[PDB]
Write a protein that binds this ligand. Structure first.
Ligand SMILES: CC[C@@H]1C(=O)N(C)c2cnc(Nc3ccc(C(=O)N[C@H]4CC[C@H](N5CCN(CC6CC6)CC5)CC4)cc3OC)nc2N1C(C)C
Ligand SMILES: [Cl-]
Length: 112
């Protein structure tokens, strides 16, 4: 159908799916469980938490009106990781590799 429809479909069927399949996706597949991970300060520091499963559900639920809103959530997920953690941390390296894949898939976003 319309370009906007193809774009949101692309984000769900290709971008989200390929990120999930990537070996470094596992920390981003669920919301941070602060009790489990022993991180009382996580939701003190991160006020706009985001994860791939939340994105998945929103795409399934037709929550986003346009592709840009979904891309915002992906970017928020990466930004959260960069903000909370420190340079050189393994989690940051992982996020950077995942983000690179994200950018590559974005570069092929249909416009017609
Ligand atoms: C949230 C910040 C950042 C981030 O930005 N995102 C997005 C993120 C997302 N997801 C994860 N995943 C996990 C990270 C870690 C674990 C783990 O087992 N951690 C264990 C560390 C040792 C703890 N000890 C404490 C005292 N011990 C002693 C016993 C005798 C009392 C026994 C148990 C138990 C918990 C599991 C994960 O998933 C299952 N990490 C993330 N990070 C990491 C840098 C923490
Ligand atoms: Cl794994």
């Amino acid at each position: 159908g319309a370009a906007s429809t193809n774009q949101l479909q692309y984000l769900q069927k290709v971008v989200l799916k390929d990120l999930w399949k990537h070996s470094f996706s596992w920390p981003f597949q669920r919301p941070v469980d602060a009790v489990k991970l022993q991180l009382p300060d996580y939701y003190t520091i991160i006020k706009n938490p985001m994860d791939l499963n939340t994105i998945k559900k929103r795409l399934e639920n037709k929550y986003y009106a346009k592709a840009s809103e979904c891309i915002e959530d992906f970017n928020t997920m990466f930004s959260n990781c960069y903000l909370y953690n420190k340079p050189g941390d393994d989690i940051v390296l992982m996020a950077q590799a995942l983000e690179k894949l994200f950018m590559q898939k974005l570069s092929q976003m249909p416009q017609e």
